[PDB]
Subunit: 396 residues, 4 copies
């Protein structure tokens, strides 16, 4: 009580409440502090089963409760991957109606036709700092020095982490006298948000010192130089890739398309071409798809991924082609940063969804990436197929 | 329990459970149906306080429980808007650590400096179908017909809704013989995803028929022609805008920069130029910012926005400029689809977060959009300011 | 005579002052020998030129030393089924690249034996977008609304500077923080309108600046070209909203014609176009979803005296090839093609002659020329994609 | 001569067969009179040329009728402080646009009185990226892996076609579904290498095609140019990975020099560049973050006989102008400039001479030429931004 009055007078801030009073009681006190400023009473945000101690330590600050996202599931989904095999039930958490229904319909169609073939094309997490040099001459010198002394930098970077490994620094961009070297790391099963930052920091300080020994003065302005590129849509991430680069594909027979999707192959090809290809092209889109972000989002929320990386998951191309036997349908997601350890996967409810996939813990990130790609193709196929049905009806 | 065995034998599917057994028990039954398949037992996802009846009807399918996202808050945040004025406490729901701390720090700095000036530059929700014509000759005629008969189409579109209002159809793109007309709507307080789809659907059927009376045969292939653009990063949304286009700004004095941000004005300008501008340019990014998606994401989850729309919230340019008095710091988000009614704002926990802002219900979407814009400025300032501190340290 | 040559070497007088002292014709011979001595090499060809050196120095070039010769060829016949261009044409093309004229010439013959190309000009406008600085976002929004409501007044001021130009819109009006970027849209008649819209837009900004000062809102234009034109740069605003002449050309070929003339199949043309022009350009994050636009635009632009730097804009566009029931549908879409038939480089003698061989020199011929440009591009694009589809078939078997 | 001209009008013989029947020079006089008759207009100027018509018909043109004359001027003096080009130069420029040569000439004189331009070649490579069709993504991954391991083998096959070309890498190797786009990276010596890399890549693709046939992996090249090269189109891959010559030029001006020669202040230059070249290009979603590159590239490309269409690629780049303590830092970065000093259009008499006026015709001179291009661009770009800042100051 005496505590609540000091916050209203702004004597103490809500952030030091965890040190004064217990963390669990600090949350009940911060919930009532806003209830009185806004003058409204809350009922639902109070209830949570998640551990408030580890949450305040690794996932949230100034906690007042928890928000509840409705959780559904789509399945069965037969996946023909290299790390994920068998029928799966994908948990999806969204507030949008018809979305889980869309994916669930696509899952059933795909499973009765042999399943999705999905492969992880690449796996890397990047961090591109911005380093200021005195002149372009020093920038050229810095680029050359980094290329020859890679092995030394690798040792310095890898000393910060037991799981991360530096595999390349390419490309190394130069704008005038500013250099953007793209550190490429293997992060194991983690997404590696903070891992690559710690490794890159020591590598930058090491690079900073060794050049000082040769009368070349440089200094790092920021470890995230917006060439990473993190939580933004960028061409470098469409071409060179980032996180897990995934491709999923299916071959459907004309009989299966008419039986389950109630349409024809050339109708799917036409919808995909006018919408996903030409439509995205003339509107200058980087997402030559229809549904990636929607499916990424629901699956990202359930498993505790970084919400902001849905930005990156929306890039990719959907290719649908008329074959002699039926259609070839594929989705290409060159930018999908995921992890099965750390971050939001430790949160209780999100931890459970990964376990329902068999994907919580080590040696399971690639398995998760193959599920992500397979779930996207199911939803994308369901939608393009539904649009092609309308394309056929209106065609007559 | 006799029911549980029929699901395993795939006699009945988990979607048919709601009509046979009560919806509340249908959730407990399929929750155990996935526990048996994956062979793991769940404790947390089972707990929810949200109404499962309205959720299955308007937000989710095949519900098995709920996911809990940690909910925090950042404040106080003084807003000098046209619809929002005074100090606010912004609820943020995220699984990322240090994020709520970042926004809260920027909120305090911003508040000790008179607050944020934010204005809504535009408010519109768009839908651009793909229409196939016989030839480019018919495509031009379709373009001309739509322009002259605009008022007629407007009435047809507005017949589906009392809140919606068609205000323009611009631009109208043509690629060969395919037409992409961008329907522009005023959605009031809603985001209007389905509102504009029903409205545009009736308008297209009307255009389709009226042109048939001239023996010009056209037909809509799909209502979302990937020129909308919805849930994808596109230039058309960066230029012509989509949803609410918001701009926020603050004028900080050199004394304030040194007192609260612990840096200098030229270091803020330099960081923003090398990172947010040049860095994003050479990597061919559409997000010339640092943090938009992260802040958008936390605020979108708490208030029941579409998670997938975080993609669109990541577009924008951050402008930081060294003035004689100090610095000018502004954020420009031309693409922010928000609403205060419908969709995910109906969910209990998210409904409460809006009420803690005074933003749930009618005549409050513009108020919410100004809060969105200001919170981004707060978080963006905190980050660039922290990076400029390190930019100063390493330079000496 | 030769003593001036020594004064140039001592840098007593500069090369731009030579035209007033000695005749322009002799002023060119002087500075040509001045560079010959500095570089220590003798020239024999660039000194030859039949173009008028007087009007060239006045309207097209500075510090003239001679002329560069681009080989000029032609492709035809090209049957065009347009609204302003009709009949068989012989298109003059100027390039230094081999096999280019041959490719277009082959496509011209194929296209003509199949009924010709249907081409329409989708739009015709020249744009200018200044950057205006305001004190705050509050002032910028007020500036945006003021421009929208007082359009007719702005229109009158702008149109007073010219007899042919006409301000038709100011859209969109972009705002970033406190800076405003309004896109002035003009109809330019037969000219490309580079300077025309600048003279008009310059006076319109002076008017807006004064009129807002009367309502206690202080603004000022930083530059008339705010890089939202977008001029001689590849930009999305030019792909969507268009700029210059927006042209679309198309042909309908029967499956038999494809086998007789293109020596391929319809599905193979569709496939090459999909893998190359669409998917290929997308994954590489290209704005040109085509194969040949720039090459053909370039050759045709040089022959007719257009702005070479606008080849940048002519490279944007999408090529659509679709397998139909009877054969294939092939179209090209060029949303950004700034061309003109009067002013600029169309005044130069040799380029003036290339326009007359098309019947396109002078007024009321820009739309005809824009329809010829579109037809020539489709001809070249089809030839190439068709040639590639033959190899796609061969290697597939 | 009368019976031949009549046979062309009757379409008895075609104009392309005239070179074999009658002499190359007279076939040109005949083709000129054939079109003069069809269009019914008489020509006087194009008939006048001095270039050798025999070698032109063999390597540069088809169906020649004469020549077009572009006015040729020069700008100077231009002091260049490069690695292969040093001292004052006089750059020949060929254009039909007024005021252009004056702009560059003004910038050349200003720059020379301030110590000259520092220009460096960041990279030199010519690329060709075919599109190759595979049966499935599984085979596409195998193709990618095979290409990487068997690089040395592919290198030998490609290098067997030329004594100057040397394949240095095949990176990146993009995969979209089941289509592979491997970017062959070549060193072209002094040539631009359009046909050099095409012949080399053709032999390498047939080699890859067969070597996989030995493993029962069936692939085939759809086209050698898969539109990921990227050739004569604006593409992000060329902005990031670069193509042709990647050039950066820069100058350091003192505040006194800016007021004496450019008639402005350093902060006016910085502001113009930020509002125009950076923010302006960003909101319009442009890839050219500059003001003048294309205009100067074009005039210099025409004079020296480069491929006209590559002006497209020369329009990419970022201009950086920054207020320093002594004055201003001004730089231009052109990541995509395909040029050559041997072959192609450099053999044409008039263009061959302009290169000789630079000392850049022949071997071991392409890098010298690329440094001239970069310095000339900076000269023109500075001239313009400096002139605009004069108006920016006046109106303020
Ligand atoms: O706390 C912060 C940690 O970062 P975070 O939790 O936010 O997420 P994060 O950035 O993705 O880092 C994950 C952390 O978990 C550890 N780890 C445990 N098992 C791992 C596995 N199988 N693969 C890769 N890393 C594994 C790593 O420690 P090491 O650095 O020792 O590898 C790494 O620091 C500091
Ligand atoms: O609605 C529920 C489902 O949500 P939803 O997906 O339709 O969300 P939505 O797509 O954003 O549409 C909003 C819905 O809410 C109604 N509405 C009531 N008051 C409103 C206001 N002040 N502003 C805007 N819309 C308002 C509209 O009815 P009207 O169509 O009659 O305007 C509209 O159907 C059922
Ligand atoms: O001098 C000339 C160079 O022109 P420029 O480089 O200045 O190109 P420009 O900037 O695009 O302007 C063309 C000029 O030519 C005039 N003009 C003459 N006939 C015309 C027509 N049919 N359509 C449109 N404009 C026409 C216009 O004068 P008005 O604006 O006074 O009509 C206009 O100022 C040779
Ligand atoms: C036919 O091709 P093109 O000449 O029209 O254009 P191109 O594709 O640029 O080829 C240039 C050709 O010129 C030859 N060459 C002579 N001197 C050279 C040098 N210093 N550097 C590179 N190449 C040189 C090469 O022949 P080789 O292939 O025989 O080396 C090369 O194939
Ligand atoms: Na504690
Ligand atoms: Na099957």
């Amino acid at each position: 009580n005496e505590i609540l009055e000091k916050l209203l007078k702004k004597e103490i801030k809500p952030y030091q409440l965890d040190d004064l009073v217990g963390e669990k009681e600090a949350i009940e006190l911060r919930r009532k502090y806003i209830e009185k400023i806004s003058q409204v009473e809350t009922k639902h945000i109070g209830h949570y089963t998640i551990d408030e101690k580890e949450a305040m330590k690794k996932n949230i600050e100034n906690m007042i409760g928890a928000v509840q996202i409705p959780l559904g599931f789509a399945g069965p989904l037969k996946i023909n991957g290299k790390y994920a095999n068998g029928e799966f039930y994908v948990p999806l958490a969204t507030t949008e109606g018809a979305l889980v229904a869309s994916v669930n319909r696509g899952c059933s169609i795909v499973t009765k036709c042999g399943g999705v073939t999905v492969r992880v094309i690449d796996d890397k997490m990047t961090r591109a700092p911005v380093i200021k040099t005195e002149s372009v001459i020093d920038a050229v010198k810095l680029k050359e020095w980094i290329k020859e002394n890679f092995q030394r930098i690798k040792e310095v970077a890898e000393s910060t982490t037991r799981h991360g490994k530096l595999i390349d620094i390419n490309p190394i961009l130069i704008v005038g006298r500013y250099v953007y070297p793209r550190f490429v790391y293997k992060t194991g099963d983690a997404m590696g948000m903070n891992m690559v930052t710690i490794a890159t920091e020591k590598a930058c300080n090491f690079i900073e010192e060794e050049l000082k020994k040769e009368n070349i003065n440089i200094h790092t302005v920021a470890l995230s130089g917006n060439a990473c590129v993190d939580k933004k849509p960028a061409g470098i991430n469409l071409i060179e890739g980032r996180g897990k680069s995934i491709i999923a594909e299916v071959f459907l027979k004309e009989e299966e398309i008419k039986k389950y999707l109630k349409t024809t192959s050339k109708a799917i090809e036409q919808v995909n071409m006018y919408k996903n290809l030409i439509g995205s092209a003339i509107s200058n889109s980087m997402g030559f798809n229809a549904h990636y972000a929607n499916i990424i989002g629901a699956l990202f929320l359930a498993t505790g991924q970084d919400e902001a990386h849905i930005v990156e998951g929306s890039l990719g191309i959907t290719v649908a082609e008329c074959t002699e036997d039926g259609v070839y349908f594929s989705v290409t997601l060159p930018d999908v940063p995921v992890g099965t350890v750390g971050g939001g996967t430790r949160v209780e409810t999100q931890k459970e969804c990964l376990e329902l996939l068999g994907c919580h813990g080590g040696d399971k990130a690639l398995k998760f990436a193959e599920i992500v790609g397979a779930t996207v193709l199911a939803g994308e196929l369901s939608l393009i197929g539904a649009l092609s049905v309308g394309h056929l009806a209106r065609a007559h």
